[PDB]
């Protein structure tokens, strides 16, 4: 009962916030003599000085569970992968508060890898079932080249085979290209009207941009882009009427840490009360060797349940996702985001506020265009 | 645009209360984070408290803890600070601004718009 | 607390020339700095959020750096409406300690 927590917290007030919530889960619910110890280390920019420190700071403390948070900074990269990287050496588990990015997801390349959000899983799964319930069967999907959005694209189409429909097209345009005019040209000459868009700031921007010279702001034109396209550049030049997401709780650093630590000291004490666990290793340097419980701690915390916390159930997926997690339609109304859509429960209920699409329409328009001009 | 109004300053004999109105305009102030900072004149700045969306967390600083009172209203987008036991250290002129707290996720901090301010002085 | 140290604390130059304004901080705070503007007699502004990130509405001169514990922030070209003073605001934790002024102003 000697358990240590390293963890990395970005900035310090998260860090003392950590420790705060790593004491109260420690005097409440579930308390013995010695339940844990609380650690924490700040999250350098270095991303080699940061996964070394990382390391010597964690290994040596002997710890069995790390937080770890990435900031949504877009300049600087501040990624998760070094430290994720070093931990996967060995079977520690770990957690990603903020980690919004799809690379994680696959377990081959990062096997002792959770987190308590889904990067765009869930919200792919919300637009499916958005346009299940309004009455959309064309999709076109502006996927970029780029991991997470063949991710997405991968898992829209498992969907979309579910009920054994399939995208017109699925184009896709490499990241950071100015020629999409091509693209959006290709789009129009088609037969479908609702877009599904997937990229990043820069992208979203200058896409946007392209859609309002090219006269694809106006009426028949429903977007659904996702919440990594509402903000910056991308949500200036973001045309009125686009159907985004918010992610309710807003990926909040003090409710997924209290909920991370409840959840640890869940899976510490069910593994001390169930069996032995191997004691990390006393160096970072110095021995290769596997850890023996990893893999059992793993299959632990996907099989933990935690009600308690604020978004009451909290299970994980076999990919080690957040499920049923709170989602929000958030519909641009007069350059300003206007709550209309709320998801939980994988439940659609749109509130009182009026979703107006791009062109000033007032009612539903229609997935499909009858060109007549079949060649 | 986006405008912030500070009203309520004025001439407040020391140890006396005074009422700050910190008045919000071209946006909606429930979905927002503000913060009072003081710049006594020929010094630095200092940063007072924070107002969180709740209204149940306020870090108020460690010169002017447990004296000052800060509330908001949604319905009028109006920040009202109260100042209670004014001394000489409280002779600067106080900002409102537009915090950083909603902007991406949390933490952040950066203060953007400010006002034009109102200076209160103490002079027995 | 923290504590950022700014040197020189008053320094000139010319309209066209190289600004550099060194932020020190007391501990590594990593990129968690904010950059701000005070006209004489009026109200600081933000240009430079988390020390890398340019603010919409400001001109491209204005570019900063630095990580860790020490920050440098850097002007391509002084330009008249440039004059003020400037000071470098962490928010690393509380309290939100602010820096101290820069005072830039002309070299005759």
């Known amino acids: 009962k000697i358990v240590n927590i390293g963890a990395v917290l970005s900035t310090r007030k998260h860090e003392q916030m950590f420790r705060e919530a790593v004491n109260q889960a420690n005097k409440r619910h579930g308390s013995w003599k010695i339940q844990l110890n609380a650690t924490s280390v700040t999250h350098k920019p270095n991303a080699i000085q940061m996964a070394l420190s990382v390391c010597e700071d964690l290994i040596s403390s002997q710890v069995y569970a790390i937080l770890v948070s990435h900031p949504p900074t877009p300049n600087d990269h501040f990624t998760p992968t070094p430290v994720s990287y070093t931990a996967g050496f060995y079977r520690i588990p770990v957690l990603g508060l903020t980690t919004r990015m799809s690379i994680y997801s696959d377990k081959s390349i990062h096997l002792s890898f959770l987190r308590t959000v889904p990067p765009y899983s869930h919200q792919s799964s919300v637009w499916f079932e958005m346009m299940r319930v309004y009455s959309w069967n064309h999709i076109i999907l502006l996927v970029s080249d780029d991991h997470e959005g063949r991710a997405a694209q991968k898992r829209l189409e498992t969907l979309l085979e579910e009920r054994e429909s399939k995208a017109e097209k699925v184009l896709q345009f490499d990241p950071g290209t100015k020629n999409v005019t091509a693209l959006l040209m290709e789009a129009k000459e088609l037969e479908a009207r609702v877009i599904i868009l997937s990229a990043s700031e820069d992208d979203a921007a200058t896409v946007y941009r392209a859609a309002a010279m090219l006269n694809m702001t106006g009426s028949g034109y429903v977007w659904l882009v996702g919440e990594r396209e509402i903000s910056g550049n991308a949500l200036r030049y973001a045309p009125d009427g686009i159907l985004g997401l918010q992610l309710i709780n807003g990926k909040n650093e003090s409710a997924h840490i209290s909920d991370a630590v409840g959840v640890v000291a869940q899976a510490v004490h069910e593994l001390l009360e169930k069996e032995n666990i191997t004691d990390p290793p006393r160096g970072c340097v110095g021995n290769t060797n596997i850890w023996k419980t990893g893999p059992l701690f793993k299959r632990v915390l996907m099989s933990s349940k935690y009600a308690d916390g604020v978004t009451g159930r909290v299970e994980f997926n076999e990919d080690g996702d957040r499920k049923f997690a709170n989602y929000s339609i958030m519909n641009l109304q007069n350059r300003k985001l206007v709550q209309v859509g709320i998801y939980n429960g994988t439940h659609v209920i749109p509130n009182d506020r009026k979703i107006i699409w791009p062109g000033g329409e007032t009612e539903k328009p229609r997935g499909y265009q009858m060109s007549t001009r079949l060649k | 645009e986006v405008q912030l109004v500070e009203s309520g300053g004025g001439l407040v004999k020391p140890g006396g209360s005074l009422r700050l109105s910190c008045a919000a305009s071209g946006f909606t102030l429930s979905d927002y984070y503000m913060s009072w900072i003081r710049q006594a004149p020929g010094k630095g700045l200092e940063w007072i408290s924070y107002?969180?969306?709740?209204?149940?967390?306020?870090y108020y600083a460690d010169s002017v803890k447990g004296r000052f009172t800060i509330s908001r209203d949604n319905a009028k987008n109006s920040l009202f600070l109260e100042m209670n036991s004014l001394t000489a250290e409280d002779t600067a002129v106080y900002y409102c601004?537009?915090?950083?707290?909603?902007?991406?996720?949390?933490?952040?901090?950066?203060?953007?718009?400010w006002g034009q301010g109102t200076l209160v002085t103490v002079s027995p | 607390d923290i504590q950022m140290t700014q040197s020189p604390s008053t320094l000139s130059a010319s309209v066209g020339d190289r600004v550099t304004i060194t932020c020190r901080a007391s501990?590594?705070?990593?990129?968690?700095l904010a950059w701000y503007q005070q006209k004489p007699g009026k109200a600081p502004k933000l240009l430079i959020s988390?020390?890398?990130d340019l603010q919409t509405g400001v001109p491209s001169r204005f570019s900063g750096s630095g990580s860790g514990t020490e920050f440098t922030l850097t002007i391509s070209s002084l330009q008249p409406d440039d004059f003020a003073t400037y000071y470098c605001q962490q928010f690393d934790s509380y309290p939100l300690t602010f820096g101290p002024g820069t005072t830039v102003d002309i070299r005759r």
């Open positions: 107002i969180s969306v709740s209204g149940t967390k306020i």
């Open positions: 988390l020390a890398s």
């Open positions: 501990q590594s705070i990593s990129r968690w």
């Open positions: 601004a537009r915090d950083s707290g909603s902007t991406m996720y949390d933490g952040y901090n950066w203060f953007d718009p």
